[PDB]
Structures are given as C-alpha cells and as structure tokens.
Design brief:
This is part of a larger assembly, with 2 copies of chain A, 1 copy of chain C (106 residues), 1 copy of chain D (339 residues) and 2 copies of chain E.
Chain A lengths: L4 E3 L2 E3 L11 E6 L11 E5 L9
Antiparallel strand pairs in A: 1-2, 3-4
Chain C lengths: L3 H4 L6 E5 L13 H17 L12 H10 L5 E9 L4 E7 L11
Parallel strand pairs in C: 1-3
Antiparallel strand pairs in C: 2-3
Helix pairs in contact in C: 2-3
Chain E lengths: L1 E3 L4 H5 L12 E4 L1 H4 L6
The chains are: A mainly beta (54), C alpha+beta (106), D alpha+beta (339), E alpha+beta (40).
The structure holds zinc ion (ZN).
Zinc ion (ZN) binds next to loops of chain B.
Protein name (chain A): DNA-directed RNA polymerase subunit beta
Family (chain A): Belongs to the RNA polymerase beta chain family.
Protein name (chain C): C147L
C-alpha cells in the first residue's frame, strides 16, 4: 500500500495491508512533519453494515 | 475476529509466536489453561500446542556429565565439551524458552546438571 | 577446584523386573487415560505403516485404532511402573489390552 | 590390539510395527549401520559380536511422533591402540611445512599426523610407506570419526632397555590370565612361519639393534638366538617355557629381569638374574611378577605383529628398493661390534 | 540440591511434559503378537 | 545416533572457574563487535 526504497543496493521497507477485510483508499496525502520532511499519510475506509456479532 | 495458521512471526529470544493479532502472531494458552488441560489429563494436546505449536525443540545432553552437548547429524558433529571421548549424547524433547531459562541460570553462576533417565534392560 | 561433572556419576542402568501374572495388583480394566493413549499411539503408528489385522476397511487411522481396541486386535502392551528399587531394579506390571476390560469411550 | 567391548546405546525406531516383526535381525542391522567403522567411547568399533541385553520397544512419551526406542547392551569386537605402539605401514598423503599427514594401511583406518620438525620435511615424501612409533595417550578416539588420530615418530630401534625387580611369585591363576597372551603369541608365530624366509630375515636384519655377518640371527623352530661369540655367560630364557613351568610351579620368578637390545625382540627369550648385573642406564623398577610379565608379553606381541606386518606389506623386492632410503636411514643408527 | 522431576511444574520448567493422565502408563510394543500376525 | 532420553533429575550447584573454562567454547579477547558483515572473531558477538 506504500512503496518505499532505501539507499544503502536497496532494501525493501515497504508497507503491506495486514487485515482480514479489504479496505479502500479514501484519501492519501503527502504532508510535512515537524522537521519539514515528507511522510506518507493514507486514510482507509470500510463500508460497515450491521452484521452478526455487532 | 482472529485466526492464525501454523506459521508466522516468532520472538527472537523465546522462539514463541509474537503477541496477538496486532503483531500477526499467535494467541495465548496461559498458565490457567495448562491447569485445565492437566486436570483433564490431555497431555498429547499440551505437546501439540506448547511444543509443536509454540516453541518446542530438541535438546542434546551428555549422559556422563549432564551438561548440554553438541550434536549435528548432517555435517557430523558428535561431541561433548566436558568429556570429548566419553560423550554419550541423548536427545531430550524440550522447548526453547526452557533452554534460554537454563542458560540464564548458568549466566548467573548457578550450574544446571540434567540427570537423564537410566537405561532399562530385560534380564538375560 | 574441580568441575561439577567430575564427581557426577550417571544414574546406573536398571533391570526390568516383571511381576508375574498371578501377583498383579492393578485393575484388569483399562483406565480412560490408558485406552485413550493406546488408541492415540496405534492411530499414529497406522499413519506410519497402515498394516492392520482389522477385517473391516476404514478410511481413518483413528477409526481403525478404535475398532482394533474394541475388537481386541491392538498390538500393544501396557506397562505400569510400580517401583524403582534403589538397588537398581524397575518393578513393573505388563497388562495386555486384548485381555482387559475396555472403559466407556462413547 | 583387538578385543571385546560391551557398549550401551539407545536406538530410535521410526517404524515400531515393522521393527518388532523381527527384533533380533533389525537390531543387529541397525547396530551395524550405526556403529561399525566408527569411534565410540574411547574405542574404535570393528565388528558387532552380538546383543547381550535389550529392553522392550518403548513408545516415545514426550512427543506425538508415535515412534519407538530401545535400550541395547551389545558386545562388539573393537581395536584400541596403546601408548607408544608400533605400526608398520602408513601412506603419507600430505607433506606440508606445518605438519605431515599419513594414513595407516595394514591396521584399521588410522590417521597419523606427525608434527613437522626441520629434520623431517626434507626426507619423507608423498607415496612412501614407513613404520611409525606412537606416543602417550595421543590416540584420542573423537566419537563418530572413521579413524583414530595419533601423533607419531619415524621408527628407529632404540639402544636402551628396562630392568624389572620382581619380589613376588607368578601365581597359577595369573598364569591362566596370561595364557591368552601366550596363545596370541602362538598364533602370531604359526602365522609368521608361513612367510618366505628371505623377507623375515631381511626385515629382522634391518631392525636388529646391532649388525651380524649373515645367517646367524634366526632359528625358527628352536629360537636359540644369535651366535655372537657367547657375549653373556647365561643363556637367555624362553618366556613361554617359563610360563608353562610356573603353571606347574617348578621355577621361581624372583630377581632382576631384563631384555637388552642384543636380544631378538620378536623371540620369546629374555634375561633373568639373581643380582643386578645388567648394564642399564636407568634404575630398575621394583614391581611384581604380574606387571613385569604383562609388559614383556605385550612387547613380544607388539614386535611379532610388527615383523608380520612388515613382511606382509613388502611382498616384492622392487618396493623394498623403492623404500631402501628409509632402510639406510635406519642402518646408520645401528651400533657396530666395537666392544 | 538434587531435584527429581515429578509433578507438573518441575517437568514444565524443564521443557518436558508431566507424567500424568495419558502419559502415566508406559506403552510397549507387543512383540509376541506382531511376529505371529504381521510380516515385514 | 543420539538416542531418546528423558531428564530424571536436575542438580543445582555453584559454578566456579574450572566449570566456566571447560564449558566455554571461546575466550573474549577484543572489544570489536563487527569486522564487516560478519561478527568479529574474539568479540562478544562471535559466531562460536
Ligand atoms: Zn559429557
């Protein structure tokens, strides 16, 4: 869900979606942190009906 | 909702699964669950869960001195660093957190010697 | 001055003393633990070999082992360790599950 | 040597139902497959004599494998090498600057690693077969290995000897004990008697401490010794005859016993005296008849084995000439008749 | 201190299983029945 | 070749100098942790 490469040639510090139910990318942004550095921000949304167990 | 299968992330020290769903690890059969399974007499379930599914391993111990030995079938190593010619290695089923536990006791200058069960023989 | 392994002497080997059949004191009925263990061991060993004298055909090791226990064809013996003498003996009772009472395993 | 040893092991059975259809045959097969040709408990296993004592096939309890295990006490023919023994054949395979590596040929698989000294690297080469002398307890039997590592020295027969002062009699039951060694010597002699006279004679001439001007060193049937100008006023005594007489208790074994280098090491002869008149450089050792007899019998067996193995290895004179350089290196260490 | 292994906690800390319940009695293979009923 | 065994008892003792010098497989000599990718030989991270 977020690609990420790192110069040392490269090692893959990528991010995987480890949840049982599929989500949908609602909104993604590239803002600046406190030290003025770009970081990845992903919002994941779920369509939740009432279901057995709620 | 949560479910794991036979494999996944493992703790570096103890060799057991990680802690729960957040870490993609396993769930816990705590102290009180072993009390219940011991009360039921279910010992082959305790092997399956606490050994075959948590952190079971094989420990090698020399008969003649009770100390851990070094055994490797492929790339043949059969040696004890305490006898070196009187080595009599028997494999005991253990689990990694217990071997870590005995090394933590030896690191504090308390020596742990394991007396193995003796050989038994029919007469004549 | 020495190591602990110096004075360590391994436990001496034992002789298996078998109580004769007429002086056995334990029950001639399998406990539920003993029947469960016999069926478990036999089922795993059927998962290894598959050779059995059971006349009817089953598709599971567990069913074969259960019917072998029930029909008295299970090729195992039950060793009940009574005592370990400090002179170096192991007094045990050998019980043949083909000739014992089988508990209620519903 | 070669003798019997009783071992204890625990075998894992991966298929108990099949294994128990014939326990004796399967047990012999597995013992042979695991232990034959390997080092185990300070010994090297040659053959499996039999299974003395076994246990039932227990089912393993600490795992759900359904597998079995069986405790076995078995008797095996093994070969234990003694300190400072004498091998007759080794093929040097590695000749480096640091160490020399060779392997025994006649005896059981043995690796001999001679530490390289400056006087050794310029003589021994790859392809040569030489006799070696061992060292004290350097024959470590590291378990699981197919050979017995031992450091050794290129053999040159010594010029010294030992003297044993015995003050206790050789009893009858200890003579019964040494009967095995006497019988071993008898078998070694009857095995040597088949060989060609020239090979045994030349090897004896090479490895005799002194030199003798031919045809004066060997009387196979009687062992009368070398006829050199009657050096000693007392005839050397046959060890076998003395033991057979002490079986019937007709002679006494007290006094000073010595085997000077002039004596033939492979013969059963030795010197006994009531007073210490041996020209030894070392003090005589006060000991009983048991120790002295054991040491002398073991030396006789070792030297008979050495001569037998030398004669077996070099069946042709071409190889003798190929190894003649070692023969002369031995020869220059001999002592002449300047006495 | 020599600590014989018995009970629950002593075998559990040593990585083994208690000799209890299904593991109280030892099972051995019936040789005399297998040599006369099975084949290799 | 290693037969099946079970621990029957555990003996507790005090470990001395000889026990450490006979059980230990190597001696820590340097304070270098890593020479390269592999751990430094003789340090506290040695592969022995
Ligand atoms: Zn040891």
């Amino acid at each position: 869900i977020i690609g990420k490469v790192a110069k040392i040639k490269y090692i893959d510090r990528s991010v995987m979606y480890g949840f049982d139910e599929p989500a949908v990318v609602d909104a993604v942004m590239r803002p600046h942190g406190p030290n003025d550095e770009i970081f990845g921000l992903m919002r994941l949304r779920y369509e939740r009906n009432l279901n057995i167990g709620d | 909702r949560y479910a794991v299968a036979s494999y996944g992330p493992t703790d570096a020290l103890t060799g057991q699964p990680l802690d729960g769903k957040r870490s993609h690890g396993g769930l816990r059969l705590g102290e009180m669950e072993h009390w219940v399974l011991t009360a039921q007499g279910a010992m082959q379930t305790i092997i399956e869960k606490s050994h075959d599914d948590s952190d079971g391993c094989i420990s090698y111990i020399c008969r003649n001195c009770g100390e851990p030995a070094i055994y490797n079938a492929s790339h043949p190593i059969y040696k004890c660093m305490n006898c070196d010619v009187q080595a009599d290695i028997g494999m005991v089923d253990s689990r990694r957190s217990s071997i870590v536990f005995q090394h933590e006791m030896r690191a504090a200058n308390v020596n742990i010697t394991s007396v193995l069960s003796p050989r038994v023989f029919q007469p004549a | 001055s020495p190591s602990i392994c110096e004075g360590f002497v391994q436990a001496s080997s034992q002789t298996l003393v078998i109580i004769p059949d007429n002086e056995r004191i334990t029950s001639n009925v399998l406990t539920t633990f003993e029947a469960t263990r016999l069926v478990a061991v036999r089922a795993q060993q059927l998962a290894i070999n598959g050779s059995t004298m059971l006349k009817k055909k089953y598709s599971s090791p567990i069913d074969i082992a259960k019917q072998e226990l029930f029909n008295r064809k299970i090729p195992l013996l039950v060793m009940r360790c009574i005592k370990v003498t400090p002179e170096g003996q192991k007094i045990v009772e050998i019980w043949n599950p083909r000739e014992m009472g089988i508990p209620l395993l519903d | 040597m070669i003798d019997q040893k009783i071992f204890e092991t625990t075998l894992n059975i991966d298929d108990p139902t099949n294994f128990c259809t014939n326990v004796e045959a399967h047990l012999l097969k597995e013992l042979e497959n695991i232990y034959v040709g390997k080092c185990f408990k300070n010994s090297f296993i040659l053959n499996i004599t039999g299974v003395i004592q076994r246990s039932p096939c227990f089912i393993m309890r600490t795992n759900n494998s359904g597998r079995g295990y069986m405790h076995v006490r078995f008797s095996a023919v093994v070969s234990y090498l003694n300190a400072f023994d004498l091998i007759a054949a080794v093929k040097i395979i590695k000749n480096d600057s640091n160490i020399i590596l060779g392997e025994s040929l006649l005896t059981e698989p043995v690796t001999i690693v001679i530490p390289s000294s400056e006087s050794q690297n310029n003589v021994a080469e790859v392809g040569q077969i030489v006799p070696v002398q061992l060292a004290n307890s350097s024959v470590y039997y590291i378990p699981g290995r197919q050979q017995a590592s031992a450091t050794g020295s290129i053999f040159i027969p010594k010029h010294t000897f030992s003297v044993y002062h015995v003050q206790e009699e050789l009893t009858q039951e200890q003579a019964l004990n040494l009967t095995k060694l006497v019988n071993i010597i008898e078998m070694l002699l009857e095995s040597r008697s088949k060989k060609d006279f020239k090979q045994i004679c030349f090897f004896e001439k090479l490895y005799y401490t002194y030199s003798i001007s031919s045809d004066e060193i060997l009387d196979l049937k009687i062992w009368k010794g070398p006829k050199g100008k009657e050096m000693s006023r007392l005839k050397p005594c046959n060890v076998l005859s003395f033991l057979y007489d002490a079986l019937k208790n007709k002679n006494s074994s007290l006094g000073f016993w010595a085997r000077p280098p002039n004596l033939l090491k492979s013969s059963p002869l030795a010197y006994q005296q009531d007073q210490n008149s041996f020209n030894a450089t070392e003090l005589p050792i006060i000991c009983s008849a048991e120790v002295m007899f054991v040491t002398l019998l073991k030396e006789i067996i070792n030297y008979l084995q050495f001569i037998n193995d030398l004669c077996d290895t070099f069946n042709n004179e071409q190889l003798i000439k190929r190894h003649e350089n070692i023969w002369m290196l031995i020869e220059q260490r001999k002592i002449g008749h300047d006495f | 201190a020599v600590n014989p292994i018995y009970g629950i906690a002593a075998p559990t800390l040593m990585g083994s299983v208690p000799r209890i319940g299904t593991m109280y009695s030892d099972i051995i293979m019936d040789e005399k029945y297998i040599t006369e009923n099975y084949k290799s | 070749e290693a037969g099946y065994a079970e621990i029957a008892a555990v003996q507790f003792n005090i470990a001395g100098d000889n026990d450490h010098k006979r059980q230990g497989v190597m001696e820590v000599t340097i304070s270098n942790l890593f020479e390269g990718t592999l751990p430094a030989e003789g340090g506290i991270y040695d592969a022995r």
